[PDB]
Amino acid sequence: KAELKGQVKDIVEESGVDTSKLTNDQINELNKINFSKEAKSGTQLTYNDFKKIAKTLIEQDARYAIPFFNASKIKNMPAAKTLDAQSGKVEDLEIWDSWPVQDAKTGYVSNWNGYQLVIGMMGVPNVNDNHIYLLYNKYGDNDFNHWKNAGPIFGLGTPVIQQWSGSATLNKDGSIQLYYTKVDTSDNNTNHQKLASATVYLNLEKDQDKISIAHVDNDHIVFEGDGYHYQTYDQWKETNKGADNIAMRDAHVIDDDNGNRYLVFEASTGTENYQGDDQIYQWLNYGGTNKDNLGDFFQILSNSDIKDRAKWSNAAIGIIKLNDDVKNPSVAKVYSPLISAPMVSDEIERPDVVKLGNKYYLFAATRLNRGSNDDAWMATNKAVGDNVAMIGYVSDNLTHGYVPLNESGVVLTASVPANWRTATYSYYAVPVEGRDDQLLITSYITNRGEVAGKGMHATWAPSFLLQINPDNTTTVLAKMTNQGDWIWDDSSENPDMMGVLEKDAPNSAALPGEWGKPVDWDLIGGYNLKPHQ
Ligand SMILES: [Ca+2]
Ligand SMILES: [Cl-]
């Protein structure tokens, strides 16, 4: 004869559940719930927030849905026909996660001797070929065909040492301070990630409009996790049963007004709030009404895959302060995570902090299929054929105090199937000079590895404007650029890039053959898509 404890008895009664209808098993589970109110790891993406983000995606609301793109206008990047870091030979690469060289305080795209500079991950489709390359164009030149490739930052290499995403800013002497993810795969092919930095010096040949990589100096590891705030590789190795994610990547540089420099990055929580079975019993993780939470608790416990995922989910967006050695930084201070998703997701990527007015806006990309709630993310695939989102938060202070935008944190939601030419990912907001209430959203378009078809390569998306409202909401605007436009300037707007949800329109969001084509095995691609209203 098991008896409910005091606090949980109140919850059960408030929820309209008849206490005498509970089994001993259910009672014993309920008595394990921890009703602590103290947040251990920053602002959380809760189980309820995740459900709300999925529901908002399914609704395909004009406020949040990624705009439709004119599929017929999308081209592979001409500058991606280039020497491949892993072969030394010219091949047709694809390009995905990319970032501009930008001012550390304002985020504005830097003007380097009349050029704009972008660093991006590129490689041959369906090869494990993860390295970073420098791309350049005249500053304010919106023509996608004009970008040129200066080649791989670190020259030729192999899959043993990889470079994944980060950020970059100029030094006073005109070198680039690059923050990137160094990945070592020598230990049973694990992706052992570390935050690294290097100083990159460029040579300009003016009469050829040609930029080359001249010197790479000070290449070293900045941060690998501390174990308390952020999970280390050794901790991950010790707990893994084969289904735990590892993250220490995507460092985004930002300076405060006093010129202290920080990196904001993707990681997992350490022993401050570690993953595990115990997370299922932390009421704070649920984030709905007491009644909603009670229902969620039983959903998790009764479904083995959701329960498994819940035990391993502990994504975090972290922040560290660097010391003042700009070209050769070390860590000065490690903070608690800004955002975390214990019990909820094991992957939140590409964090991006932008200062607008006197507030800090933090955005991140995520694939909802990395979340614990299989029913929620499976519903997004059924509605749209994809499960990607951008989430966002706002704070008065850089290092703490973030509040979710649009209530749940939702900012952008997938609008087309993952295997269409116009699918996007890796959203990255860039500020716009002279428009302090808007951001330009850049992304890559077409998923990697020929999922949209042979010859359909990941490439730079048309960019679009996002309106930021002072009441902690956002709205997608009907303003769109050429592919690969990182700078919103007087000639950026190109309405021809806009797509429509119509099978045979010349500006259809679908290429011929895509409307109705299977996705996720037998789902009809596009079947449940609706005009954005
Ligand atoms: Ca985990
Ligand atoms: Cl490297």
**Calpha distance 405→321 (Å, rounded):** 25
- Tell me how crowded residue 137 is: count the other CB atoms within 10 A of its CB: 24
**Calpha distance 191→339 (Å, rounded):** 23
**3-state SS class at 345:** strand
Among left, alpha and beta (phi > 0; psi -120 to 50; other), residue 130 is beta
Is 487 annotated as contributing to ligand binding? yes
**3-state SS class at 485:** coil
- Tell me how crowded residue 521 is: count the other CB atoms within 10 A of its CB: 5
Q: Decide if 143 contacts 128 (C-beta within 8 A).
A: no
Contacts of 241 (CB under 8 A, 6+ apart): none
* Cα 170 to Cα 103, 474, 486, distances in angstroms: 7, 30, 17
**Calpha distance 177→326 (Å, rounded):** 8
Report which bound ligand comes closest to the CA of 311. Answer: 1
Q: Which of 49, 84, 94, 97 is catalytic?
A: 97
In residues, how long is the chain?
Answer: 533
What token pair was written down for 493? 């707007």
Is 175 annotated as contributing to ligand binding? no
Extended strands (E) in 224-270: 249-255, 261-268
The number of C-alpha atoms within 13 Å of 156 and in the hemisphere containing its C-beta is: 6
Is 308 annotated as contributing to ligand binding? no
349 is catalytic: yes
Q: What are phi and psi of 378, to 5 degrees?
A: -65, -35
**Calpha distance 195→249 (Å, rounded):** 6
94 is catalytic: no
Q: Which of 49, 94, 224, 349 is catalytic?
A: 349
Q: Decide if 69 contacts 363 (C-beta within 8 A).
A: no
Q: Decide if 72 contacts 506 (C-beta within 8 A).
A: yes
Ligand 1 centroid to Cα of residue 239, in Å, is 9
Among left, alpha and beta (phi > 0; psi -120 to 50; other), residue 217 is beta
The full set of domains in the chain, from first to last, is: 1-484 (2.115.10.20)
Q: Name the DSSP class of 325.
A: -
Ligand 2 centroid to Cα of residue 370, in Å, is 28
Q: Decide if 127 contacts 86 (C-beta within 8 A).
A: yes
Distance of alpha carbon 122 from the chain centroid: 17
Resolved by: X-ray
Is 244 annotated as contributing to ligand binding? yes
**Calpha distance 497→479 (Å, rounded):** 10
**Calpha distance 43→451 (Å, rounded):** 35
What token pair was written down for 433? 């000079």
**Calpha distance 342→310 (Å, rounded):** 8
Contacts of 433 (CB under 8 A, 6+ apart): 108
**3-state SS class at 250:** strand
**3-state SS class at 29:** helix
**Calpha distance 438→139 (Å, rounded):** 20
Q: Decide if 252 contacts 177 (C-beta within 8 A).
A: no
* SS percent in the chain: helix, strand, coil, step 5: 20, 40, 45
Ligand 2 centroid to Cα of residue 149, in Å, is 18
Cα-atom radius of gyration of the chain, to the nearest Å? 23
Task: Tell me the resolution in Å.
Answer: 1.8
